[PDB]
Amino acid sequence: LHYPVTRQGEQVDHYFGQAVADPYRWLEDDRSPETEAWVKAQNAVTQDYLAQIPYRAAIKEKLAASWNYAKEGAPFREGRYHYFFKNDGLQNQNVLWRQQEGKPAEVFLDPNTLSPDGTTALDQLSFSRDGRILAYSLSLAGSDWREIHLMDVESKQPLETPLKDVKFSGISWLGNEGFFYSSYDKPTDQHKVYFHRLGTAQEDDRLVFGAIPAQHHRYVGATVTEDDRFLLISAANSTSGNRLYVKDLSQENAPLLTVQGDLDADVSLVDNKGSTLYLLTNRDAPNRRLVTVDAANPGPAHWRDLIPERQQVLTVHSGSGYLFAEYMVDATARVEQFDYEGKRVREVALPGLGSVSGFNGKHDDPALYFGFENYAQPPTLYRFEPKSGAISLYRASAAPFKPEDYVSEQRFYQSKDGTRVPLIISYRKGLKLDGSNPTILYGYGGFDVSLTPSFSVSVANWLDLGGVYAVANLRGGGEYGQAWHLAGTQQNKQNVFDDFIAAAEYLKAEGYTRTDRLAIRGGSNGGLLVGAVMTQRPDLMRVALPAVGVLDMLRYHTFTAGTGWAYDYGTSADSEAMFDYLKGYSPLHNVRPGVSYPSTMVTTADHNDRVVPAHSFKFAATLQADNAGPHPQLIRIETPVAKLIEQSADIYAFTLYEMGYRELPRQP
């Protein structure tokens, strides 16, 4: 294996009187002739190395064959039909089907064919209270503009001419009379709420909110409660904070009452019961709380906590006369069922530890549906009986992976300083803890980002090859509260790396794998994680896979988009202490001559605004110049799902090959 020559320049930088050489400074220009030629030469060496891997084509074949599969959503009743979305696996847009009990299912609305070349997309969908009329918004191209169409659902023909010039709008019906929507014009950065009455022309739509000076806002929204009693109007100027107003529709010409008159917090309607409003908000509660207040005097001073804020971020769903609080605890789903009076009915017995969605329904739905998935289980739909709490399988995934063939377990290990850290491990059933299993340990560790379980075909293929997939919930993440995040920032960043090293040691100590059967992986802040751990403990793993990483911690902030990461990392310009700390772990600056590094495959696109290739380019150049051991230090520069399949195949093939496998660990 002969690496392309990478010339070293003479650039030398200085920080607080300290000199730091940057011989690959020229690689920071990803569009210069010399860099683009380097990229081409590196890719040639990498492709040549990968070409010798015997089973690379077989891995790619299985990935491609299992990548696409049919999907179906939960059914919902509107009028005399149950509607549900489906996707055959290749369709660009989901297709809406419907079925009347006692009859066969039929296609109801196929967005793909709304325009030859399928450039017309289905956005909002909203049926009248009786389900006889459907109002839905469509978008053309990558346009923010919308048209609201009105269809008679039985004949499937247009009821009226579509509403035009709609933008950033919801569609909320008031019974079967008409619906509220938002628009900037009549019917200029002044968003307004309008009411369209069925049987009338758009030009006659009543202006509801937003015209007088005190109501001028860039974004407004309107929602009518399911019982048609209240109109809630939200108004905002940006993504942070919104005012909220309520109007009692059961009263003749009721004025708007102020639920929240400032933009200091987010607050939104969950539902009402009688004159009681149920609101989800982050006002004085960053993790959110569910509150109630009487609609006749709805100001924040009167809000009463129904579900007080907790350490975990709250998501609320309502259905069948119950409220459901969803949280991710130790990074996995927990759902609690409450009645509208605040009594906790039960903790819902979810199918296992994973991620969920759903529990959304109408007041009178006899059952609710929820989706569940994790590293070893494809998205599956379950039916939930609200009264009994009974759960049953509604639709198994069409993905070519049977959940019963896999195992997912959560363990907790201790980091160097005693901190207990969560670790989710997945594999094919029948695995033995004899320390021989090829394992990929994945982590991120930063920016309050939580690593929660999610199914991916690529990971599932790894498990079928006989691999173990482990994900550590390191400090710096969002799995707990602010202290957990902060414990992995600025001058505490080392904790993240120590947490990851401890996960690798735990996997070995527990018999899942061993040093020559272990690979570590991560992207972006996760790439930094890999770069840092492989430079501090190059002997801990056999393979290192840093993707799109931030690897030059001394100059990351001077690059495009780097300024936004300053809160988590700090910059070499902050102070001598911050500079010394950053230089202490910066991967680029900690690669050393004579050291034997693990087999490495650095990955990145040839051009990137978020995380510039410069990081990966300079890091790969330095590994190639400094590594003295037998392992290859390669870089794969990306120049559709086709590319994703090729990327995953190269990584798994490279990983197994570097571990010495002549054949797959297990025949999939």
């Binding site: 942070s240 982050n282 960053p286 993790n287 309050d448 969002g478 995040h485 809160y567």
Partner: peptide
């Protein structure tokens, strides 16, 4: 206020 606005 969001978690982000620490």
């Amino acid at each position: 206020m969001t978690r982000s606005a620490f």
